[PDB]
Amino acid sequence: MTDRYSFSLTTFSPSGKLGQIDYALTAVKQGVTSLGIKATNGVVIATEKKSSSPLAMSETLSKVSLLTPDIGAVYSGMGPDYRVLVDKSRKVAHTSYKRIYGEYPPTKLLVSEVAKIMQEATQSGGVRPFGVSLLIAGHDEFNGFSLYQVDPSGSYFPWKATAIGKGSVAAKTFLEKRWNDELELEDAIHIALLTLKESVEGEFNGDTIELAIIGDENPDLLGYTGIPTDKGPRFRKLTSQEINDRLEAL
Amino acid sequence: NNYDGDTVTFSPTGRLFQVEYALEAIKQGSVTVGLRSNTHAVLVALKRNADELSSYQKKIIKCDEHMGLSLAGLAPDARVLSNYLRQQCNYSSLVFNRKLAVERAGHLLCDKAQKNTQSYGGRPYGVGLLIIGYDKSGAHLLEFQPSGNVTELYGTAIGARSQGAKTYLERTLDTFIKIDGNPDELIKAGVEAISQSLRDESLTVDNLSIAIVGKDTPFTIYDGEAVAKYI
Amino acid sequence: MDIILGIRVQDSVILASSKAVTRGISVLKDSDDKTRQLSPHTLMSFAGEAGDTVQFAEYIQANIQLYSIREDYELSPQAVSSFVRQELAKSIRSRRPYQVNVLIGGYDKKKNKPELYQIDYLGTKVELPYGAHGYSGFYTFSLLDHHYRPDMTTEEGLDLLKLCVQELEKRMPMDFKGVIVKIVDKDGIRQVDDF
Amino acid sequence: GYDRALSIFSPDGHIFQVEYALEAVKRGTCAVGVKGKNCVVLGCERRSTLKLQDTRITPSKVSKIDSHVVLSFSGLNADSRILIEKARVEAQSHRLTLEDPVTVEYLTRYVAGVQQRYTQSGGVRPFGVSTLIAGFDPRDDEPKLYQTEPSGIYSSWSAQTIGRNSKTVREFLEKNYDRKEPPATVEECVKLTVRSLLEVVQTGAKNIEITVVKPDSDIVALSSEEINQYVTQIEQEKQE
Amino acid sequence: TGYDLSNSVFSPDGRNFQVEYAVKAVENGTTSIGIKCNDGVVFAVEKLITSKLLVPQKNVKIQVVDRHIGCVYSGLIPDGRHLVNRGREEAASFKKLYKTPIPIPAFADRLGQYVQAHTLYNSVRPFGVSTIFGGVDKNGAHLYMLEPSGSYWGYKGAATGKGRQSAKAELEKLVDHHPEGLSAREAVKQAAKIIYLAHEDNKEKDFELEISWCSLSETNGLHKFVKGDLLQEAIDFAQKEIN
Amino acid sequence: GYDRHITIFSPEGRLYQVEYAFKATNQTNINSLAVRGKDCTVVISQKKVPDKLLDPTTVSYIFCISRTIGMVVNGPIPDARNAALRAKAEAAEFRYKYGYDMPCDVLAKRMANLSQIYTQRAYMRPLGVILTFVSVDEELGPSIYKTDPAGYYVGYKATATGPKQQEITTNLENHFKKSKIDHINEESWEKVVEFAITHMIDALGTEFSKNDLEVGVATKDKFFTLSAENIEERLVAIAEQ
Amino acid sequence: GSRRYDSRTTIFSPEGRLYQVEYALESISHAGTAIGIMASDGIVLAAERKVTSTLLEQDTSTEKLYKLNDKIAVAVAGLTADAEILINTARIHAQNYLKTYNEDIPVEILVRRLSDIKQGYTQHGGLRPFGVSFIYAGYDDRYGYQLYTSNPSGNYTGWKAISVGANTSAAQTLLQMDYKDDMKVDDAIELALKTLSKTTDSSALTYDRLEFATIRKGANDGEVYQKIFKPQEIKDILVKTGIT
Amino acid sequence: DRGVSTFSPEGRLFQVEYSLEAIKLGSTAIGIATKEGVVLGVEKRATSPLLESDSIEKIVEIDRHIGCAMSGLTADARSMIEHARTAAVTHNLYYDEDINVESLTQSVCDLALRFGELMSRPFGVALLIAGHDADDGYQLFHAEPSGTFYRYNAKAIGSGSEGAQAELLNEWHSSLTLKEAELLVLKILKQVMEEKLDENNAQLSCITKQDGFKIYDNEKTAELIKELKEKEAAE
Amino acid sequence: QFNPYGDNGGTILGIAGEDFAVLAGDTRNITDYSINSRYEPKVFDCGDNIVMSANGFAADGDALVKRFKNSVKWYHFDHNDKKLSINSAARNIQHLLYGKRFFPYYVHTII
């Protein structure tokens, strides 16, 4: 018994390609489209909630996840792989940062730690790479707002705006026409909804769309008062009702 | 064919070829015989040399004062398995002041050989053993196969052309089982038994190996001029 | 063990180290050299627990020599002293700590300057114009506070050192059988045979 | 832990991973050792497809294991650093416990033992390196030259070469080296070494390294000009 | 293909061919059975007499676990001993921690999980045995049969080996003809009849019969081998029925 | 093509071993169904005992994981029990560590996470099972959460699993289209059980005796399975209407 | 067992080459070019970003050029994720040396240890090698300015000017042509940018597809300064040499 | 590929069998046992004339009363010798006595099968172990990578073995003098060797109760070579 | 605090002649001021004509004799039934004792 697979399952082919990483990106291509847009005073990350059955309660399945009060994640590719990556990501923001410095990590560094975890699934013994591309949006005092893409390889790139998954090629082109460096958060949400409609086929409402923002501090979502320096999470998930309000003035 | 790479693989008809291939090494081995009465148990072994300049590979090993065995196949594997038996016999003596029952000795060997047939990286033991002993329930003879199968018998033989001696003992069963209180006669029967497995070669003085254990006889081995009596 | 002294002057570091090895009511040796050469321009003296001293000294010596052979280069006295401090600082929380007190006298060839470091078993490092370990300090520090000048010649240093040995031979309870004096300068390490 | 037996016997009785490790040696740059009456000289080829090199900082081909022994090699460069490091650590450990520096034979026996260990350990491949180890035993003036190879075998040589085209230079040394009369001086020994490399090298410019070890830790590396003088002198005697 | 070359690999069907191959090893083995009764269980097995040289009564195949459970198996005999050795370790640790002797369903899952574990990795081989086992606990009698896959169920009657179908047919008749229940002493006899009837599928070599039982009234809830007068009585009953 | 033997990606980004483990799911040829009432969550599953020698009381694919959580399995019984023992242990540890009973959805997530690991780690095969967890959560109320060999999991209004799952699924979809609500608007669990059997009968097109079925019922503070006579009592009630 | 699926990453070809190292180098040859040039008064690092998208955030980005300590930096060609693993090891190693000896780590010592780690992945453990080639640019008071390169084999060498990644063959020829020893930093900056411009697989070299850095003694007296160029500074230096 | 400890269909271990082929490529080593002593001789076989032949070390001391010769992958023998020496000395430390030659040989053979998936492969070298003890007198043992050892009155191993062994079958008798054995080893080595035998490419050694194990000088063996050539010409 | 040692009293005596040797010991076994046994033998025949006594703390005495007896057994198994000479027995017993140098067998040993 015991894990006898102590050797790499991802190895270089004569042409130079890393087969499993390529194939993982192929899985990400098949995945449902998700996107991220960076405004001046916030970031929006969105995706379609592909329901597996109408008897399923798609609210119980969250594609957009809070990592820290100021960082949120969304993905394209394999759900289960994403879910465990979120668990691991949330923990590493504590163990390797909060438990040391008494504050939450800046986006680029949390992103860096997730990319490490995904890199190791590319080199370590007896594991396949993760079959997901992440879009991580967040805020921190000294870098402001930022948006990152983490690929199966472990590579991460900062974006003004981008999409990943099914209809990413068309969505990116759409985002290039509409993005400028003066976009306000509400203008970014409006473009996010427009861009998503192109890649969504069936119902397009607040129950089939999942969308969150990194913006102002939300003191009402803090759960307590009395500490002036603690002002609340900048990560917020838009409600099904809040989406439909914006779909009328679309 | 495609299913003989290792012991951990079953063939489509439910065979373990590595275990069968281990069994084959025994078949190439030099013939050894085992038989018993109600008072004594006797091993007889034909020893094999490399050429006329070499010694004759010893086939019989003592385990305790009341137990021992003979081997046919890979001799280093017999050394491992005997050494294990020596410890097991020894443990029983030191901890319980008890002589290890020849039956338990069989069960222990079975379970040691078995583990090497179910795991990756290992191989089956490539040797067959004939264990004789005298314990609280009298004289015994066991046959060990590296498949794990241990079998208690009145008489038997393993090795090349063992079928001759095994047939002979099957015919002689009613005679030799009642050779009680007579060591030299029980040996004679075993020496005649092994003579049914000889081809072109006959039993010489540095060729024949005999062991005996019983009621008033510690497990002792006879080589050289001490077996001349029986040729 | 017992008495180890060090004086840094204008152009050199001079180390004096007692020659006695006493165990119980017997002086077993009166010519013991309580020093190791770590590199061509670095010397370390040592005093403390029996066995521990020479074992630590030679362990350090092997490491510095290994470094030398790897990089084809001599570590600075500052660098060596920091390596030695860290080893002792590790040691003090071990299951059995090295009970060794060292002085390191070196000549930095890049700086063309003598340097003297005092490090105790805890790993307490200090650069000093003059140094002492054990009870010796109680007589020599005040003496050197008075007579020492920073611009002294090697010869003046040796006369200043004679004054220290003399005081110790007058007021110290034990016979330490004199000292072995060694000089560290631009030309390396050499021993004064008549002291 | 990674356990795979990578070095195993083939039906004909060869250990292919050891034998392929020899091919890596055969690909490496030529190295030659020649011992005189009172010295050993290590010569090394340096390939010239690499211009724009910085020769101050680039790893030298001949390494000092201690102040009295040197090691040159042929094969995988990265591999050789692991052997050199271990050798240098053993050198200091020997001085510590025996209170005497290593003999050249001992240091070589250690290096070869390491190499051999990598031929029947699980989860490792053999070293793609053969070494020339040269020097003088403590308080001894007799020159010592040894050679090791991936299998783990080592032996003493009056003169030996390893690397690419080593068979050509070995040929040269086999007819140009007299066992009855080894190169009586440093100059003679360096020249015979430089000559043997010139059979294989190309230009005697920045292609040849020469290191001279003499008794009592007397090791020095020759500069370009010093070596170039040997190159110049040899060619003028050749036109005859 | 090549799906059958490695344990724990799913075929496109969703099958583990290596287990199915282990089942072939079981089908090759001698016949063993288990009959559940009023207040207990009865086990019996066919012992092929390969040669005259085998000592009768002296190559015992039925095994006890703890003091209240009995185990018998068909296939690779060593593999069965391994499973019992574990069974004993499991039972001992249960009795150590919880004091009470291990209940049969609890004991059944211990063996089940252990055997199931040998279908999870490619570095182990599945067990080459089907094992019939059971006993009496605080909730009465239980009989089980466990297969190489790790699958096991509770049984009224159970059979495995070369004569499993013959034996199964014979078991089903008993279940139909005795809805109220079979007595322990009756079941011992029936076991002897069935082993003799299942021997038809292995009739080259003649055989030796071995029977054991656990009964709340007859053996006081403890596992005991059927020997002497009771055994010869059961043999005779069986002999009468084949003629 | 060793990419089909272990859980690494194929050129098209697929995991065949995970896919084949899904096919192992239907190897038992049993269909299961879960629905929710106001106060309860009812799960039912077919019970096929082919062999006359089997003890029918020991043939079960419904498990009591904790006092509050029940789990029905679709797939081979060895893998099914493997899952059930781990679930029990996980639910027991959660309670000891965190001071309160493990929720159905959290246990589901945890088991799904374990399943995910087998899809990423090579030495461990996936279990050829689909696990349906049921309870009446003290916070979320009646709950159905379901796990598969891919490591996927999601909550349900109702659900079905097995070879003829699509027929049952649409049958349930069509009912909830009609009723316009997320659950069975019924007071007693007895009638929710009756609804479950009624709608299984219609979708499968078969009639059931008391021994053709298996029923688990989760209520507040306990999950229990029904006896043959409890089911028979329920079958009589359906027939008399 | 699992033997079946073992690639055997750390074995020799019949020709005495390491398959995986060779294939990793083949992978690196498709990564964006990076150039290092050593002048007498400093070092230039120049690297081409891999085909950029217009919506990439260019200023808060780092892909090619990383800082190991205040005196040493690296240019990266290959898998970035692999490179960061190694960069973090290198960064910790530098600090260890400083904590031990109270002196900044000599460049070669750092380069050797990082190269040694790579070597290990080619000899034992059964893991794939790091698909990375580094250009090390740094300063210490022993050798002054130094360029090095290491590759997946764990072999490292010292250079006056060197390129890694794509089109090294053409790039090296060009560097060999116009490099001379008495060169200054500003001349080297030009040579670097000119070479990339001629070897690039893009249509035209622009500020958004480059990373740039210098290591000068151009601070104030006997001390070294690392300058990782901002986007606008690359835009200006590209105009100053008349490429755009 | 396939497991390192795999059986062939003929019941033999592949890797052990293949290592026996490696030994057949080795240089010839011959041992003859007499009542006056055991002689061990080997062919040095220098790969090139520049190689200093006296650095070729294929005859080795294990203890004062035990010596050893080798053939095959000789680099594999170093750890076997290291073990043998430690086994010998250790036994003297534990029991204040010399260790029996057979006990030594059994100890070395215990390493042999300690390979698999312990070391990665069997040894690729065969050993001739020659010694003396008070119980069984002068002994010669052939130790194989199989883990098997046979006692021999005489034995050749290596490339020239089957031819040399056939010669040893004719020449050996129970009354050979030490001198007779010395000459016989030289004679048979000369026969199977490629290059012409002399004091530089062949080596002799012996173990006697009185003087223990001794490797002969090149001067001593040269005279035995000369004595041999003169004796063959003398009839 | 638990004291792992005790004193079982008694005394032993060994004398050697030209072709013989005697090893004597009283048979009394005690703890404190009580008698445990009037006849408890502590002189033993260990095979190969070696007699041995380990006197002091009987539990350590018995443990040592038990180990040495077992040593004699294995000596035979490992060295072709060779007789263990008294000088070799002595050297073996030294290692048996010194092996517990930092938790000693509390006995005077005579063979």
From Swiss-Prot, chain A:
Its main location: cytoplasm. InterPro entries: Ntn_hydrolases_N, Proteasome_alpha, Proteasome_alpha-type, Proteasome_asu_N, Proteasome_sua/b. Keywords: Cytoplasm, Isopeptide bond, Nucleus, Proteasome, Ubl conjugation. GO terms for biological process: proteasomal ubiquitin-independent protein catabolic process; proteasome-mediated ubiquitin-dependent protein catabolic process. The keyword Cytoplasm applies. It is found in: Cytoplasm; Nucleus. One of its GO terms (cellular component) is proteasome complex. Transmembrane segments: none annotated. Gene3D superfamilies: Glutamine Phosphoribosylpyrophosphate, subunit 1, domain 1. There is a cross-link at K108 (Glycyl lysine isopeptide (Lys-Gly) (interchain with G-Cter in ubiquitin)). The 26S proteasome consists of a 20S proteasome core and two 19S regulatory subunits. The 20S proteasome core is composed of 28 subunits that are arranged in four stacked rings, resulting in a barrel-shaped structure. The two end rings are each formed by seven alpha subunits, and the two central rings are each formed by seven beta subunits. The catalytic chamber with the active sites is on the inside of the barrel. Belongs to the peptidase T1A family. Present with 7060 molecules/cell in log phase SD medium. This is Proteasome subunit alpha type-2. It comes from Saccharomyces cerevisiae (strain ATCC 204508 / S288c) (Baker's yeast).
UniProtKB/Swiss-Prot annotation, chain D:
It comes from the Eukaryota. The keyword Nucleus applies. Gene3D superfamilies: Glutamine Phosphoribosylpyrophosphate, subunit 1, domain 1 (3.60.20.10). One of its GO terms (biological process) is proteasomal ubiquitin-independent protein catabolic process. Its main location: cytoplasm. The modification Phosphothreonine is found at T58. It is found in: Cytoplasm; Nucleus. InterPro entries: Ntn_hydrolases_N, Proteasome_alpha, Proteasome_alpha-type, Proteasome_asu_N, Proteasome_bsu_CS, Proteasome_sua/b. GO terms for cellular component: mitochondrion; nuclear outer membrane-endoplasmic reticulum membrane network; nucleus; proteasome complex; proteasome core complex, alpha-subunit complex; proteasome storage granule. Coiled coil: none annotated. The keyword Cytoplasm applies. Pfam families: Proteasome, Proteasome_A_N. The 26S proteasome consists of a 20S proteasome core and two 19S regulatory subunits. The 20S proteasome core is composed of 28 subunits that are arranged in four stacked rings, resulting in a barrel-shaped structure. The two end rings are each formed by seven alpha subunits, and the two central rings are each formed by seven beta subunits. The catalytic chamber with the active sites is on the inside of the barrel. Interacts with CIC1. Present with 16800 molecules/cell in log phase SD medium. Belongs to the peptidase T1A family. This is Proteasome subunit alpha type-4. It comes from Saccharomyces cerevisiae (strain ATCC 204508 / S288c). The lineage of its organism: Eukaryota, Fungi, Dikarya, Ascomycota, Saccharomycotina.
From Swiss-Prot, chain F:
This is Proteasome subunit alpha type-1. It comes from the Eukaryota. There is a cross-link at K222 (Glycyl lysine isopeptide (Lys-Gly) (interchain with G-Cter in ubiquitin)). Present with 15200 molecules/cell in log phase SD medium. Signal peptide: none annotated. GO terms for cellular component: mitochondrion; nucleus; proteasome complex; proteasome core complex, alpha-subunit complex. It holds the Pfam family Proteasome_A_N. Belongs to the peptidase T1A family. The proteasome degrades poly-ubiquitinated proteins in the cytoplasm and in the nucleus. It is essential for the regulated turnover of proteins and for the removal of misfolded proteins. The proteasome is a multicatalytic proteinase complex that is characterized by its ability to cleave peptides with Arg, Phe, Tyr, Leu, and Glu adjacent to the leaving group at neutral or slightly basic pH. It has an ATP-dependent proteolytic activity. SMART domains: Proteasome_A_N. The lineage of its organism: Eukaryota, Fungi, Dikarya, Ascomycota, Saccharomycotina. Keywords: Acetylation, Cytoplasm, Isopeptide bond, Nucleus, Phosphoprotein, Proteasome, Ubl conjugation. GO terms for biological process: proteasomal ubiquitin-independent protein catabolic process; proteasome-mediated ubiquitin-dependent protein catabolic process. CDD domains: proteasome_alpha_type_6 (cd03754). The modification Phosphoserine is found at S227. It is found in: Cytoplasm; Nucleus.
Curated annotation (Swiss-Prot), chain I:
The keyword Ligase does not apply. This is Proteasome subunit beta type-6. Its main location: cytoplasm. Non-catalytic component of the proteasome which degrades poly-ubiquitinated proteins in the cytoplasm and in the nucleus. It is essential for the regulated turnover of proteins and for the removal of misfolded proteins. The proteasome is a multicatalytic proteinase complex that is characterized by its ability to cleave peptides with Arg, Phe, Tyr, Leu, and Glu adjacent to the leaving group at neutral or slightly basic pH. It has an ATP-dependent proteolytic activity. It comes from the Eukaryota. One of its GO terms (cellular component) is cytosol. Keywords: Cytoplasm, Nucleus, Proteasome. Coiled coil: none annotated. Belongs to the peptidase T1B family. One of its GO terms (biological process) is proteasome-mediated ubiquitin-dependent protein catabolic process. The 26S proteasome consists of a 20S proteasome core and two 19S regulatory subunits. The 20S proteasome core is composed of 28 subunits that are arranged in four stacked rings, resulting in a barrel-shaped structure. The two end rings are each formed by seven alpha subunits, and the two central rings are each formed by seven beta subunits. The catalytic chamber with the active sites is on the inside of the barrel. It is found in: Cytoplasm; Nucleus.
